[PDB]
Symmetry: D2
Subunit: 417 residues, 4 copies
């Protein structure tokens, strides 16, 4: 019987086991033998077939029959990448031929899919067929607008529940939380958690008009929201910050971000966006009775058990991968569009300028973004022109109306309105 081998690459997202089980169960009904490589390409890169065998398992019915309930991945994952070296690509081809892998399914992000196609491009199309399922919790695949990537619904819903606890705690014991949503690629996750939880502010890189963000502008955007709520008798709230703000900051802004220090270098992971903003804002607003606390939301989302939407999603994706194998497809990506799972050739999704799959960002001109903005607390252009409002907010910050306009009014040209 033909051999299907499956591996996972990149950082996990809820529903990985759903894809493994959808593909495995269907393949077993077809009579296929299914094996799973542990930790992605890590051991296939060595080329030693004995080492690979020690880190491959038989994906049987009993193993996968109920993993659709479970977050994580039973075959683990790694960022080991064979595409960088032609020796590594040939080591992967050597082990795949030794195991008689007829069908090769990878579940991972762009780097994982590119590794799978590079292994196939130097391999006979009759002995091996390669299919990849695009993975990302960030919702940044170029699907039709409003259609989600798998795992995003689970991450957003758990993020809403965590922020709910922080909303009740900030009101019960007046304080501001600056929640930092991990993920620098796009603002879908930060804005989704914020809108669902009714957070009082959300800042994503997509809403900044200029190409480079300044540290001062971010501080003042949060400062204005705190003062406006304070003018309405509320010295507490929650502000959600997409970590992608850091990757859009200028060189000078990053210098201030790291404590007026030289930014580390080989390193945006060492940055503490929420922490730095909390310190600066306490300098400016602590005298007003405002306390501010940072809080990161990230790793606890990646392996939460999938919600029903993602369970159905990944079951259909696993099926579609096997169907693509049956219909002779190769070097294709299994995506779901308009309720239909279908294979799409890797190059059809690539952005020519980058060489990787195109990144779908938050559309800040859409009506959905304007609706989310409506339920946030913030000073719009019209608000700065409302003199009664400006007088109350300035007085809340213990400053003259002219000083408030002098400091904050320019922010209407920093972010879309």
């Amino acid at each position: 019987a033909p051999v299907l081998g499956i591996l996972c690459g990149g950082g996990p997202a809820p529903g990985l086991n759903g894809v493994i089980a959808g593909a495995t169960l269907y393949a077993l009904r077809l009579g296929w033998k299914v094996i799973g490589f542990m930790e992605g390409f890590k051991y296939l890169c060595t080329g030693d077939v004995d080492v690979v065998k020690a880190h491959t398992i038989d994906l049987t019915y009993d193993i996968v029959s109920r993993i659709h309930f479970q977050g994580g991945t039973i075959i683990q994952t790694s960022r080991a990448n064979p595409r960088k070296s032609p020796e590594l690509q040939e080591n992967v081809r050597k082990c795949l031929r030794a195991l008689k892998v007829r069908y090769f399914l990878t579940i991972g992000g762009d780097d994982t899919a590119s590794s799978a196609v590079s292994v196939a491009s130097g391999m006979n199309g009759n002995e091996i067929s390669v299919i990849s399922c695009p993975k990302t919790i960030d919702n940044d695949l170029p699907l039709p607008a409003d259609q989600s990537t798998f795992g995003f619904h689970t991450a957003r819903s758990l993020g809403m529940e965590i922020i709910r606890n922080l909303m009740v705690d900030s009101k019960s014991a007046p304080r501001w939380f600056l929640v930092e949503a991990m993920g620098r690629s796009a603002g879908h996750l930060a804005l989704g958690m914020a809108e669902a939880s009714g957070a009082h502010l959300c800042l994503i890189p997509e809403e900044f008009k200029q190409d480079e963000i300044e540290f001062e502008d971010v501080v003042e955007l949060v400062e204005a929201t705190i003062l406006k709520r304070l003018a309405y008798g509320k010295n507490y709230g929650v502000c959600v910050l997409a970590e992608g703000l850091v990757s859009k900051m200028s060189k000078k802004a990053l210098y201030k971000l790291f404590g007026n220090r030289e930014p580390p270098t080989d390193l945006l992971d060492d940055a503490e966006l929420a922490r730095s903003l909390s310190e600066e804002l306490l300098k400016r607003l602590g005298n007003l009775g405002i306390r501010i606390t940072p809080k990161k939301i990230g790793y606890e989302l990646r392996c939460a058990d999938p919600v029903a939407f993602d369970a159905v999603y990944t079951r259909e994706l696993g099926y579609g991968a096997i169907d693509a194998f049956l219909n002779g497809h190769s070097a294709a990506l299994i995506v779901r569009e308009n309720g239909q799972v279908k294979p799409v050739q890797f190059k059809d999704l690539l952005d020519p300028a980058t060489g990787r799959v195109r990144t779908r960002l938050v559309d800040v001109t859409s009506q959905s973004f304007k609706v989310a903005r409506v339920y946030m607390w913030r000073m719009s252009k019209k608000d700065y022109e409302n003199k009664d409002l400006v007088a109350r907010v300035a007085a809340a910050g213990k400053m003259t109306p002219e000083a408030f306009t002098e400091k904050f009014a320019h922010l209407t040209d920093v972010v879309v309105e």
Copy 2:
């Protein structure tokens, strides 16, 4: 004086009602509007007594609604009181709305609530009052573009999956079959969604039956064949999900057997009381007569009322926030006798009459599309005997032996089921 927006809920609750109330109220308050909420739908507006109505209306202020987007249920309650049947009741509602000076009238409910709102508007000046309705249903049976959900459906399906998960662990830990009955007779979206997400071994919905009337025997044998096939592979346990809509598709003879070979109950006016039917219980009793000797135990379990007021999941929180906003936007844009729906990520008003099926006069009901690829995929991961399976003699011999019967007896009893449901 600021314009008055009045809000009410009609029909059975669904997760996210408070999200629609809060989206409309918060945005309206930023516009300077005064917002009031009628308690229990049309119940008190139908009396015509303005004193009674005011005793059951409340001021929807910022503090009241500022955080109800986290909460299931509806803070202004709901009712199935329906003024559309009587012009006296329709005029009583108009009388109280004029007394309260309602400029904008938002109803949140199902089909009957929207039809009541439009009937109240047709005898009302479009300049004094504007009426908008937001369609509600956990059953996912609104005619939205295919595969796009109605609000509340995601929450109900996800909680249904988690309950069935516990029943899947229990059925395997202590081998047994659960016959889960998903409440709701309108369509099979909810039953099939819970079943596919939870990996249930079978799902039966009215949509998959080819004939216009289902027979009680056919339903019993469809579950029986699944139990026997599982038993042939060494598994004397499982979970089968049943849409309650199977009952409303059954023939007269089938309903007689369903109610215990007794006369089906009827209301004073002469309507069969299908709520008193216990589909999962009756099927469990019959199947225990046939399969108990094989070591099979079967237990029914209903999933229904515990879903209606669960706290909304994030998808429904975003959904209902956008719907509440879209209702206020529709009022601002001069729309009336319209329904706020979301299509391809865009909330927009759609005239009530544009959504009516001309042959019926009511809104068209979207059922599960059993020809779609989604249904075919869900069916793949169920345990069942397909057309191809009945022609496989090796498999048929294994299943027949599991049921302690000859292969010829197995084909005689179960093979006809391929003409009962689409394949």
Copy 3:
């Protein structure tokens, strides 16, 4: 060779079974022991065929058990297969245990499982095998020091609270009464725990009835009085929790009415089949006849099987970890024919005889102490008519008027209820 520890589960699952298996296995593996798990309790050990037993036994290795403490259910399954009835079955078990060289034998189950393990041990030499059982019950009916819980009870009570919460929101959003029936006929701990935690408006357990046999009419009137008192305060909705144990205290006459004025169903041996009773459904029908004119809707709802394999809450995870460790410690100290329980924060072995009530021959049943302060506090927050309430003429006039009857008719019908339940 390393000593062999064999583990099995019997009876119905409870949250934390996997915690006991993993606590015992991990500690034993650090001692160098070999650990095996029998699938489905005594089911296959009863055959006596060593090949069949091996086909349904697995090696409990570190990898198998390292993370099952998060999971409800039992990875080695369970059954009520019971060798205590036959020494042919007991000797079939003894033959397979000797063949597998089981030095230590841990069973996790109820009375039937522990009694089976000791009967198998009494006909073996104390040098070749040592037997320890861990008592299991989700009902909280072990004779531990008062208010100290059995493992699994916290998980079941907490999930029951969450289900009832959704029903409390739904009953208020769409005015109606739910009659929630907490499955389990042994005691009232589970029903009372869910009700008090959820703030349910009434809870009825068999323990609070003074007489030895309950009458169907009295139960109907106790719920009726609560509904009428709530109605007198403007509340035509609520939730009432009923322990299924009420059925097992009902008289022959009460059971006749319960089953529809029919002869109660019976098994082949002539014993009554109380599982076929639908307590919540029957009370809902009767109460709708009496109160439907008042605008009251009543709906039954069962809570049972979805609790048994929910993932354990932290209290039960720590609990079952300590029990599994304590079982290995008991083996190390030479104990046998002992039960591993936790008392006053200390896991200890307790000889079978200390827990047996001579009248039953099985472990003593700890019921709810209706004289305790905890029960009196729970009763305070319920809606009900106390002795003093019946003496309050103003209150009786409001409640009777709520039921559309005279104060004398209300007192004549309901006042006797003060002698039916403890006050």
Copy 4:
């Protein structure tokens, strides 16, 4: 009718609303009038009766009938403390007399109870034990309300991190907020099966050294690595910081002078224990294939909806507070022992050396602690004396057995065994 006034003090814990509703509902059945002071003692401390009145609300049936389902506190809370100044103590008594409060119920931890008695020594005062840290001096094995809820949610968060650390091999250093005791850290760790837990109670010496904490985590990571596991989860009570010596704190803050408030006390809130340990350990172990990530668990626990144990607990506590008022008790704390709620005089709970409420810590000599320790990965004394094991772990750390013993063996005198 008699007036019952209720307030909450300290950081929120799940079940606060349960106490308010238990006391209020029962008091309303007695015909009492119930009021709630917003934000604890904050406004009572001012002495301005006008300000206090603006921040009190009427606790009616409709307000409290269903708040037992809700985390947080509807009357908010604060750490405002009148015991520090006798002028403030007289301000609190002045406002209570002005409002004619006959019964005064405070809901909080040790700091709140000690504040209530200073007002009481010169109206009836009762306090209800609140703390997610479980550090009130209740009878042994009896939890404070909120502890069950916080421990159970912490277990669920750590579960997601356990699946993620195994799916994508890495170590998480979870920092459990709370410096008073180790009940919360040990509870979350034992329930979740975390591979290590470090609490201040297990250190023998009065002052902890930064190097020893690093090496205790290092030894666990190396022992796991010797058994084929390059991943895990370690839970750390942040109270380790409050036991560190002056030198340890210097290294903790980046070899800088520890930050300080105007009075000269160290600002331990600004410390990042988990991050600092993660940086040091990655320098030492990154070459072995070890990744390490810090993660804080704290503020998201404080206002989770109460679990059933805490709902029943706080209902009985609220009832017991009213019963104590009816029976003439004052200056007492409502505790539950053997299923019986009873008042216990404040002075019986004071530690004679301190004059403040006694703090109950984890008993590291108990059998419960020894059992939790059994399921942790660590090197005991006997392990360091096991020559075969020491050689396996040292080889895992790429060092000689002699180098391993020289570095780690002294740790048996650092923590209890």
